[PDB]
Structure formats: C-alpha cells, structure tokens
Design a protein around this ligand. Structure first.
Ligand code: HEM
Ligand code: HEM
Ligand SMILES: [C-]#N
Ligand SMILES: [C-]#N
Lengths: 131, 123
C-alpha cells in the first residue's frame, strides 16, 4: 500500500529544489569554465532549472507543462559543452548539494542521474591535454 | 507537446525560412564576404541544424557528428557587428516567412544567444 517517496519528495520537495538550484548557479556564475557561455542574468535559467529538476525527480511536470519536451541534448547543441565543462558543471552541483544538505541515498541518486545527463550534453572534444 | 520545430511549421517552414535567410545574408555587405559565393551547402546544413536544434529529427548530427558549433566558426572573423547583421537577416527572414508570436521570440532569443557565443573577434 504505502507510497514510496518520489525522489523530489526524498530530496525535500520544492523548498529544497529552489535553494539547491539558486546555490548551484551561484557557483556556475563564479566558475571561469562556465560563466562566459551562460546568459548574463541567470534568473530565468534558474527558473527553468527549478521546473526541470522538479519533474526530473518525479514532481509535477512543471517543465514540460510550460516549455514542451526537454530534449536536453538538442537544446544544448549550440553551446560549447566540452568534457571539462561537464565536469565543472557537475562540480558546481556537488558544492551546491553540500551547501543545501543533500546527502545519503537521495544524493547519490540525483547526482548519478545528473552525471549521465551531462555526459549526454557534451558536444565538443576536449582541449589538448585531455588525450 | 509540442516541440518548437512542429510549432514553427516543420520541414516546410524551415525550408523557406533558411532560403530567405541566406538570400539576405548573400546581400548583406558585412556578411557576404565571409560566406561562400554559393550558399547551397551552407543553407542545406543550416536546415539540418535548425531542424534538430528545434526538436525535429537529428538531421545535423546524423551526417556531421558532434556540432562543436563555435569551433566550426573559429576560422571566420565573427565580430559583434557581424553577429548583429546575421541576426538582422534572420529577423527579416522570419518576417518574410510569417514566423511570429511566441515561437518567434523563442527561436529568436536562442539564435541571439548562439550568435553571441560564436563571436570571436573584437569590432
Ligand atoms: C554538461 C554541461 C552543461 C553545460 C555547459 C550547460 C550549459 C547550458 C547553457 C549555456 C544553457 C542556456 C541557458 C539559457 O539560455 O537560459 C543551458 C540550459 C539548460 N540546461 Fe544546461 N548545461 C549542461 C548540462 C545540463 C544538465 C546536466 C542539465 C540537467 C538538468 C541541464 C539542463 C538545462 C536546462 C533545463 C536548460 C534550459 C532549457 C530551456 O531554456 O528551456 N543542462 N545549459
Ligand atoms: C553570429 C554571426 C554568425 C556568422 C558571422 C556565421 C558565419 C558562418 C560562416 C562564414 C560559416 C561557413 C559557411 C560554410 O563554409 O558553409 C558558417 C557555418 C555554419 N553556421 Fe554560422 N555564423 C553565425 C552564427 C550562427 C548561428 C546563430 C548559428 C545557429 C545555429 C550558426 C550555424 C551554422 C552552421 C550549422 C554552419 C554549418 C557548419 C558546418 O559546416 O557543418 N551560425 N557560419
Ligand atoms: C544548464 N544549466
Ligand atoms: C551561419 N549561418
């Protein structure tokens, strides 16, 4: 009978998603591998990401209800996403999780999903020095 | 429901939008010198790229591999002024193919962001 928590619930629901995503882009805007390629004001980027991660983790379909199918690989096609930038993005997410208290099984679950997805986003080989 | 590609009109609307686009490019004195004299190949690949970017079939990457878009533009002298000129040509193409309203701003906001990422040379 008893419903398991959706991953969204397990992480702490809306209130946690808001904080983690805001802290996440705080690190993104201060990371030299990431600042240049994002929009200058990350407000609307963070709004879409809160909607996306909400439904990515099993909450309301907030993202697809507004923007349509995420098709993230297609949407990231024009941006220079190297492996180095994928690992930097993920590093910013790691530091935001520590800052917002995301730990244990739900942390390892949400992070591994995110690592895979960022691998799907890479669309540029690395610079010399990554053989 | 539903992808920007099918919202904008699909394959048919991509065809005339990209054709009109490069007609404007070929006439723009800030852009024409850096493009090939014959734009047939360029337009064909841009149709591929826009179709996939907007959520249609994966036409571009199925033929050309990873997009690495900025890297492909690096051999060309792309200033902020030329980025605006390109955008001006996409704007008139959208006016000329009837691309309006919410899907226009969706597509135009994203091409403006991409054009800024292609810039590789000061004015
Ligand atoms: C792997 C390295 C990545 C880089 C360098 C990167 C970079 C970017 C950039 C520059 C934008 C444009 C923002 C805008 O125009 O508003 C964007 C949008 C977005 N990214 Fe990422 N991204 C990466 C991976 C990811 C991952 C793992 C996710 C998983 C949630 C994700 C989800 C999104 C979403 C939902 C958007 C907004 C889509 C929209 O505008 O509708 N991205 N990303
Ligand atoms: C901002 C100003 C821009 C300038 C001055 C510019 C200029 C050029 C030039 C000179 C080429 C070489 C044409 C050829 O050899 O066939 C090219 C190719 C291309 N550009 Fe642009 N571009 C700009 C922005 C954009 C934007 C916003 C997009 C959006 C997707 C884009 C997508 C492409 C594609 C797909 C190709 C074909 C790449 C290939 O050869 O596989 N460019 N561009
Ligand atoms: C993408 N953040
Ligand atoms: C570029 N067209």
């Amino acid at each position: 009978s008893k419903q398991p928590m959706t991953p969204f619930e397990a992480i702490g629901g809306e209130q946690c998603i808001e904080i983690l995503v805001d802290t996440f882009y705080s690190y993104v805007s201060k990371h030299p591998d990431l600042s240049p390629i994002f929009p200058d004001d990350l407000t609307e980027t963070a709004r879409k990401q809160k909607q996306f991660l909400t439904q990515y983790l099993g909450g309301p379909n907030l993202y697809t209800e507004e923007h349509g199918h995420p098709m993230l690989r297609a949407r990231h096609l024009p941006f220079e996403i190297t492996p180095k930038r994928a690992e930097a993005l993920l590093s910013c997410m790691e530091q935001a999780m520590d800052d917002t208290g995301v730990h244990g099984h739900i942390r390892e679950f949400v992070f591994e999903r995110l690592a895979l997805t960022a691998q799907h986003m890479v669309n540029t080989p690395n610079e010399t020095g990554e053989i």
